[PDB]
Design a protein around this ligand. Structure first.
Ligand SMILES: *[C@@H]1O[C@H](CO)[C@@H](O)[C@H](O)[C@H]1NC(C)=O
Lengths: 49, 49
C-alpha cells in the first residue's frame, strides 16, 4: 500500500497506488467505479478490506 | 458566478480518496485533462481595473 505498483485483483489488471479506503461498501459489493467508468476501489479477496 | 476550477493548486491530499468520487475536477485530472491557470490573477485584473 501507499507505493506505485502493477496491481491485479481477480484479473482487474492495472497500475496505481493502493490505500486503506473508508468507503462504506455494503457486504455484497466488490468494486467502485469512478464517474468515467473506471475502477477506483476494490475489496481484497484474501483479506476483506 | 460559480466555477468548476481555476487551476487553483490540486495536490492529491484532497483529490485522492474520498473526493475523487464527486469532484469533476479530480476525475478530469486523473484522466489527463488539465485546466491551466490564467496568466493574470483576479488580483492583477483588479489592479488594472
Ligand atoms: C487464505 O489462507 C489462509 C490459510 O492459508 C487463511 O487464513 C485465509 O482464510 C485464506 N483466505 C481466505 C479469503 O479465506
Amino acid at each position: 500500500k501507499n507505493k506505485c505498483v502493477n496491481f491485479n485483483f481477480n484479473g482487474l489488471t492495472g497500475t496505481g497506488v493502493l490505500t486503506e479506503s473508508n468507503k462504506k461498501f455494503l457486504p455484497f459489493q466488490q468494486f467502485g467505479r469512478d464517474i468515467a467508468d473506471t475502477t477506483d476501489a476494490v475489496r481484497d479477496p484474501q483479506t476483506l478490506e | 458566478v460559480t466555477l468548476a476550477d481555476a487551476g487553483f493548486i490540486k495536490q492529491y491530499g484532497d483529490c485522492l480518496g474520498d473526493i475523487a468520487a464527486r469532484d469533476l475536477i479530480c476525475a478530469q485530472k486523473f484522466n489527463g485533462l488539465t485546466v491551466l491557470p490564467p496568466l493574470l490573477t483576479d488580483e492583477m485584473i483588479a489592479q488594472y481595473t
